[PDB]
Each structure stands twice: as structure tokens, then as C-alpha cells.
């Protein structure tokens, strides 16, 4: 199988400057008929892939002049002369020279903006939740940039690993920020076996850790 | 002109057979110079090519990593493109796309993709969610935990869809129980808590479940 290697994994662009993504094949994509069978797609969030460029350099029929493709052989480059808000998403290269067709791992293109620290909120679980027999304690990190962030759960001052799950939104189209939920899930018994619950947040927009806590009841 | 309309069951039990259909709106499946493909995308993991067929010679190609289990057919009787996959496991949970590709640029300067259908492989029973309000213990965050549902997806809105700014609905996570959980939050002016009511509306279409919860402090 032909391996397609895409770089970088992720790119941050401020709107209007060019972007350049790289794709390299494990073997030549030139057919003896003289065509080179490599293609570029954009897949926006929750949407199906959209063909941007076919056979290295040609533009698919509805794609603006701002997208262009270059390269030969084994090395290919997609260029976006000016990235606009509408161009965010995951770009893929693909070869259709040999069976099976194979795609690159994808390049996530996001919008760069000023570093923004998260606003942190902790939600004590409602009585309904406690009578249900299992409880979820939610810690919300809202409207931060960039996407990297750390959340530690501390129960009665002790670090608590496991029993927690995280989830992150796509980049918000208005302010280019991210939000994150960290949910610590416990049984009602274990949950009521402790008193102080805290989520401790670190992020490069912060000068020091941010801790939000509550005493159960 | 041509649109690919996918359909199939959302849930398939493990070891059973997945079956998907791709209807051809605005044309016939027997048009010359087109290649028909099935591609899948596991949640958050990139695109895998399954197989395809070339109309002019009716050669059918399979990805060797799946070739044992997959059947791809053209169905002239129903103007349909079909995929069947036996002995499915959780590894086959993915969004499935059919695509029509012009094998030559004279036949077309763009391909056509179906909207994509989510197929979940699980033994869980279709179940509506429990909804719990999330209240804090200058600006305030409120939310709702949408818990213990199967399968995906769920719809969350605020105040019957009239409140959309500052709303973040986080991607669901699969629990060890095999059910999903997510949270939806919104930031509001604290000034407003005395005169405004906030209600999360949860619509779980696969189970016909509709739940409203008022969030208050």
C-alpha cells in the first residue's frame, strides 16, 4: 500500500495570510498515461469531504482561485493564498493511482488569535443526580485559546486520577476560542464519602493555577 | 444535478451484517466513465477507502484489509449503489460515505459525495437520556447534563432555540456502560437571573424523547 504522509498535523493561520500543507507519497503517483493521481479535499466539521484540487494542480469546478496545488512525483503542496474564516477544517490528500486508495492523516487548519485564558466554573451535582445513584461533577473551561489546557481533579485535597472524562468544542466561529468540559463521574456512595471537590486548571494564558471548588452540601 | 442520498440503519448488533444504500438523484447509476466508492470515517480518526467499482468494465476493487467481509454492488433495478459488511464489530462504528468519481476529467470536473450516515455497532438498547440541570454554587454559566442515551445523536437547544449566543454543546463521550453522555452550557448576564428563565430542550430523535429542564440557582 502507498502511504500518504501529511504535514503538519495542525496549522494555525491568522485570516488573510497564506497557508501551505505538504503531502508526500511512499512511491510516485505518476501513471504511464502521464497523469499524476493525487487530490486535495477540505472536510468542514460535521460535513462530508469536499474536493478542492484534482491531479496535483487542477481546481474542482466550484473552488475559488485562492486554492492552488503544486508538486510532482512524490511531493505535493496545497497553497491557500489567503485563509478566510470559511477555510477552517481538516484538509486531506489522497492517491487514486493504485488499489487501495489511501488518504493522508489530515491537517487540521484553525484560526490563530491572541492567547485567551479560560473562565472556569464548577457545577456541584444536583440532588436529583445523587438520588439517581451515580453523579457527574462538571468543570467548565470556557472561551480559551489556544486549545491545550490541563485539568486536575482534587478530592479532599488529594489528586484523583481516573473516573474523569474530557470533551472539547470545535473552534467558535465568532471569537476563535475553545471550550472544554471535564466530568468526574463517581458513584453516589464514593461521592458522599468525601467533602471537598476541586478542579485545578492550568493554561498558558494564566499566571498561576486556577482552582474552583465546592464543599458537598 | 446528481446527488447521492445515503440511508441505512444507525445501529447494528455485533457479529451481524451492516447494509447501506446510496440512491442516485438526478441521473442513472449506469452512466459511463464513473467510479463508485465507499469510504468510512471512524469518529475523529480520518478516512478509509473500503472499495469501489468501475462502470465501464464492472471491475470491483476491495481494500485487502476488509476484502473478506465486504460486498459492494451496483443495483440497476433500484438505481442504487449498495454496501454490505458482515460480522461487524465496534471497530466498524463510523460515518459511511458513497462517492461518485469521474475517472476522466471529460466526464466531470468534480466528484459527488453523499451526506454521510453514522453507523453504530453496539449491543445497547435504544434509550432516551436523563437530563439534569447544572447550576453554579458578574456573568453566570448554566448548563444541562444529557446522560445515559443510546444511540447518537441528541439535539440540545436553549429557550426553544431563541437563545443561541454563548451556548456550547460538547461532543458526547461513550461511557463504559455503552451509553453516551454530554453537557451543554451557556453564559448569561448575572443581572438577568431574576427576570429571565433558562430552559434546556433535549430532543433524542432515535428514541422520540423530548425533555425540558429549567436551570435556576
Amino acid at each position: 500500500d502507498i502511504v500518504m504522509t501529511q504535514t503538519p498535523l495542525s496549522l494555525s493561520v491568522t485570516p488573510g495570510e497564506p497557508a501551505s500543507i505538504s503531502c508526500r507519497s511512499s512511491q510516485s503517483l505518476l501513471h504511464s498515461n502521464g497523469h499524476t493521481y493525487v487530490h486535495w479535499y477540505l472536510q468542514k466539521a460535521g460535513q462530508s469531504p469536499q474536493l478542492l484540487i484534482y491531479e496535483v494542480s487542477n481546481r474542482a469546478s466550484g473552488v475559488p482561485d485562492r486554492f492552488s496545488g503544486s508538486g510532482s512525483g512524490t511531493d505535493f503542496t496545497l497553497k491557500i493564498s489567503r485563509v478566510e474564516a470559511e477555510d477552517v477544517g481538516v484538509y486531506y490528500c489522497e492517491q487514486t493511482l493504485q488499489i487501495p486508495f489511501t488518504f493522508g492523516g489530515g491537517t487540521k487548519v484553525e484560526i490563530k488569535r491572541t492567547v485567551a485564558a479560560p473562565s472556569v466554573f464548577i457545577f456541584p451535582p444536583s440532588e436529583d443526580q445523587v438520588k439517581s445513584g451515580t453523579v457527574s461533577v462538571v468543570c467548565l473551561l470556557n472561551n480559551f485559546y489556544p486549545r491545550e489546557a490541563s485539568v486536575k481533579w482534587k478530592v479532599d485535597g488529594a489528586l484523583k486520577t481516573g473516573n474523569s472524562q474530557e470533551s472539547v468544542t470545535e473552534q467558535d466561529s465568532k471569537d476563535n476560542t475553545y471550550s472544554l468540559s471535564s466530568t468526574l463521574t463517581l458513584s453516589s456512595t464514593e461521592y458522599q464519602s468525601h467533602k471537598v471537590y476541586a478542579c485545578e486548571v492550568t493554561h498558558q494564558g494564566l499566571s498561576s493555577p486556577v482552582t474552583k471548588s465546592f464543599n458537598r452540601g | 444535478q446528481v446527488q447521492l442520498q445515503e440511508s441505512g440503519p444507525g445501529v447494528v448488533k455485533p457479529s451481524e451484517t451492516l447494509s447501506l444504500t446510496c440512491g442516485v438523484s438526478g441521473g442513472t447509476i449506469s452512466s459511463s466513465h464513473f467510479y463508485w466508492s465507499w469510504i468510512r470515517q471512524p469518529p475523529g480518526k480520518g478516512l478509509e477507502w473500503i472499495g469501489g467499482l468501475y462502470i465501464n468494465d464492472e471491475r470491483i476493487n476491495y481494500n485487502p484489509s476488509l476484502e473478506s467481509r465486504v460486498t459492494i454492488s451496483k443495483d440497476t433495478s433500484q438505481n442504487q449503489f449498495a454496501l454490505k459488511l458482515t460480522s461487524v464489530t465496534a471497530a466498524d462504528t463510523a460515518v459511511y460515505y458513497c462517492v461518485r468519481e469521474p475517472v476522466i476529467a471529460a466526464a466531470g470536473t468534480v466528484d459527488v459525495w453523499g451526506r454521510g450516515v453514522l453507523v453504530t455497532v453496539s449491543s445497547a438498547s435504544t434509550k432516551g437520556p436523563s437530563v439534569f440541570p447544572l447550576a453554579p454554587s458578574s456573568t453566570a454559566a448554566l448548563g444541562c447534563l444529557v446522560k445515559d442515551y443510546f444511540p447518537e445523536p441528541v439535539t440540545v437547544s436553549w429557550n426553544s432555540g431563541s437563545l443561541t449566543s454563548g451556548v456550547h454543546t460538547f461532543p458526547a463521550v461513550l461511557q463504559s456502560s455503552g451509553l453516551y453522555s454530554l453537557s451543554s452550557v451557556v453564559t448569561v448576564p448575572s443581572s438577568s437571573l431574576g427576570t429571565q428563565t433558562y430552559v434546556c430542550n433535549v430532543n433524542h430523535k432515535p428514541s422520540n424523547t423530548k425533555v425540558d429542564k429549567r436551570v435556576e440557582i
Partner: peptide
Amino acid sequence: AVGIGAVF
């Protein structure tokens, strides 16, 4: 994609 090599 537009253009399929494996077919030729």
C-alpha cells in the same frame, strides 16, 4: 477525486 489511475 477527479481522475482514477487504477482503472487504466
